[PDB]
Amino acid sequence: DVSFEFEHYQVRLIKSSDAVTIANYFMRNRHHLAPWEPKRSHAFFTPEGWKQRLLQLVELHKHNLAFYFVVVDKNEHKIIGTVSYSNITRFPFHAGHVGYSLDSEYQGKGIMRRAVNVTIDWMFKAQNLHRIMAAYIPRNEKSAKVLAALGFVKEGEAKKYLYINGAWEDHILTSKINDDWKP
């Protein structure tokens, strides 16, 4: 099954047996991630909430409708990042949205750059997507740099795009196009 390794990390599809570790990761990083993401339900921080979500994701993956990757620190046996491909459409768009997160203690190590690059490559080659879209709040410099480094091209800006922490936030829209897409 789908697995990528570099240094002491492993990037792979999330599994049902990840329920506790993924809940631990979002609990651990609750404060760090809170100002950048929409309001989260209680189930989002719990292993029982993730048990249910994982049932849905297994089903989504069966139909090639979603691909939720975790970044594992093999030294620590814990999840330290996520790379999620969602809102996948086939004909006539062949597009998906990518969203990612990283543990607050693993910043500035090029992990997100690598994890996203290897998964985009797989989404293009193994899943035959034509387009991956990403959107980030302009003051999220780390996110901007990652996307630029990976050859995502800025497409414009949607003002007041997503409701986060009680306010509409502008987002830069960016995308990467797969020239080798097969009809």
Helix (H) or strand (E) holding 67: strand 67-73
Residue type (1 letter), 145: K
Instruction: Report the sign of the C-alpha dihedral through residues 64, 177, 160, 90, in that order.
Output: negative
Site string for a copy of itself, 134-163 (x = CB under 8 A): ---------------xxx------------
81 neighbors 101 (Cβ within 8 angstroms): yes
Q: Which of 28, 61, 94, 113 binds a copy of itself (CB under 8 A)?
A: 113
Site string for a copy of itself, 64-103 (x = CB under 8 A): ----------xx----------------------------
Nearest to 136 by CA among 166, 89, 169: 169
Instruction: Give which of Na ion, a copy of itself, none residue 140 binds (C-beta under 5 to 8 Å, depending on kind).
Output: Na ion
**Would you say 82 or 117 has its CB closer to a copy of itself?**
117
Q: Which segment (18-26, 54-62, 89-97, 134-142) binds Na ion by CB under 5 A?
A: 134-142
Q: For residue 98, what are the CA distances in angstroms to 61, 70, 174, 175?
A: 15, 13, 11, 10
**In the chain, what are the helix, strand and coil shares in percent, each to the nearest 5?**
35, 35, 30
Shortest distance in whole angstroms from residue 108 CB to a copy of itself:
12
Q: Interface with Na ion by CB under 5 A: which residues? A: 8, 36, 39, 113-114, 117, 136-137, 140, 166
Q: Interface with a copy of itself by CB under 8 A: which residues? A: 6-8, 74-75, 110, 113-114, 117, 149-151
